[PDB]
Amino acid sequence: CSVDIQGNDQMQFNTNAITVDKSCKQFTVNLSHPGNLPKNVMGHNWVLSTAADMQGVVTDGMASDYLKPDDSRVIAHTKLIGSGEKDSVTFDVSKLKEQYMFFCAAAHAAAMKGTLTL
Ligand SMILES: [Cu+2]
């Protein structure tokens, strides 16, 4: 009923998929970032929400640890960790049901994009 998640300076997760065994009443995410943060990203966290609400959470974090205080869409999140730092978050699995998304709120990319060629 637990997992170790890691990020790096290439904006990669050690895994982009997490399974929660149904015997679990609580689940714990263990976050660490042993190497450097990505360039000009000064923090790393792990955030859980619905697939629908993810974008809202992200936009509102930049509008207001890159997260809106007491955001009701955020199921669970770690604090912002630096390089070489570590944090854990444990949450009640009862608040879940089903295709949820987890993300880091500190490293942003362009939401809207396309291709151009000559
Ligand atoms: Cu941003």
Swiss-Prot record:
Disulfide bond entries: C1-C24
Residues annotated to bind Cu cation: H44, M112
The keyword Disulfide bond appears for this protein: yes
GO molecular function: copper ion binding; electron transfer activity; identical protein binding; transition metal ion binding; zinc ion binding
Residues in Plastocyanin-like domain copies: 1-118
Top-level taxonomic group: Bacteria
GO annotations of cellular component type: periplasmic space; plasma membrane
Keywords tagged on the record: Copper, Disulfide bond, Electron transport, Metal-binding, Periplasm, Signal, Transport
Localization annotation: Periplasm
Main localization of the protein described in the UniProt heading: periplasm
Function statement: Transfers electrons from cytochrome c551 to cytochrome oxidase.
Name recorded for this polypeptide: Azurin
Species of origin: Pseudomonas aeruginosa (strain ATCC 15692 / DSM 22644 / CIP 104116 / JCM 14847 / LMG 12228 / 1C / PRS 101 / PAO1)
Lineage: Bacteria, Pseudomonadati, Pseudomonadota, Gammaproteobacteria, Pseudomonadales
